[PDB]
Amino acid sequence: MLSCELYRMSTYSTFPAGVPVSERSLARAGFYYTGVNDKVKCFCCGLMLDNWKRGDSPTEKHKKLYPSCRFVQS
Ligand SMILES: [Zn+2]
């Protein structure tokens, strides 16, 4: 249903701290929180991503992994 930068930011309320990637960027790319520790998923393509490194661009990786996503255009 709802898949904006605000609704996707509301799923990052129970997200574990200490993560090396800003929640905004994660939601900006088109991912949200599913509940699993460090577990996001695309809203258009629905790609799951976790265990990120330091300074990793969510958008870049998203297009580098699933470039067929309709929300990966922007
Ligand atoms: Zn996607």
Author numbering: 25 to 98
What does the paper say about this structure?
IAPs regulate cell death survival pathways, inflammation, and immunity. IAP-mediated regulation of NF-κB signaling depends on different protein–protein (PP) complexes stabilized by type-I BIR domains (i.e. BIR1). The cIAPs protein partners for these functions are TRAF1 (TNF receptor associated factor 1) and TRAF2 for the canonical pathway, and TRAF2 and TRAF3 for the non-canonical pathway. Biochemical and crystallographic studies have shown that the TRAF1/2:cIAP1/2 interaction is based on the formation of the cIAP1:cIAP2 heterodimer, stabilized by the interaction of the RING domains, and the TRAF1:(TRAF2)2 heterotrimer.
The cIAP2-BIR1 and XIAP-BIR1 domains were expressed and purified as already described. In silico docking analysis targeting the BIR1 domains involved in the interactions between XIAP/ TAB1 and cIAP2/TRAF2 were performed to find compounds able to perturb the assembly of both complexes. FC2 was found as ligand of XIAP-BIR1/TAB1 and of cIAP2-BIR1/TRAF2. FC2 displayed dissociation constants in the micromolar range for both the target domains in vitro (Kd[cIAP2-BIR1] = 0.5 ± 0.2 µM; Kd [XIAP-BIR1] = 5.2 ± 1.0 µM). Thermofluorimetric assays showed that FC2 induced a slight thermal destabilization of both cIAP2- and XIAP-BIR1 domains, decreasing their melting temperatures (TM) by 1–3 °C. We demonstrated that FC2 binds to the isolated BIR1 domains of XIAP and cIAP2 in vitro with low micromolar affinity and does not interfere with the dimerization of XIAP-BIR1. We tried to obtain a 3D structure of cIAP2-BIR1 bound to FC2, however the diffracting co-crystal did not show any residual electron density attributable to the ligand, even if the crystallographic dimeric assembly of the protein (stabilized by a symmetric Cys28-Cys28 disulfide bridge) did not hinder the predicted binding site.
